[PDB]
Amino acid sequence: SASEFNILNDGPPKETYVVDDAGVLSRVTKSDLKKLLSDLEYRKKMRLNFITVRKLTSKADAFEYADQVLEKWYPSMEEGNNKGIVVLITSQKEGAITGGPAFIEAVGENILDATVSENLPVLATDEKYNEAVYSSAKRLVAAIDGQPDPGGP
């Protein structure tokens, strides 16, 4: 709960694009994520955030919390329309992605749940959190830019 609370309380990571509460991402990867993602915001006005958490206290799943985070960080249509929230539960190897309609439409449902059922669960199961997260960001960015799908792990 302290985790679930802090993640929600400390608003969105405006400069870093990441909240690695599970502490599974390295200095370098977070750096790469920031570079990759601030470039996405600069070019497409799409704001994509990643969150890692060890586990949820609630019986609620990843999607539920992701949506709770979206609503908290961007309480209005105008503020959240172009936002994307990716949540990764490391102890469960489970992921979720939600966001505003524009973000959702710009990515598309195909890649949306492909990322969620492939990159996140598969890579995290193998303990490769950094590649789990970076490849997911990279695959979401490709979709938004209407580039070829790199595919899953």
Q: What is the CATH number of the domain that holds 106?
A: 3.10.310.50
Give the position of tokens 């799908």: 149
- 33-40 contacts, C-beta under 8 A, 24 or more apart: 33/133, 33/134, 33/137, 36/134, 36/137, 36/138, 36/141, 37/137, 37/141, 40/141, 40/144
**Cβ–Cβ < 8 Å for 51, 85:** yes
Domain that holds residue 90: 1-153
Structural domain count, the chain: 1
Experimental method: X-ray
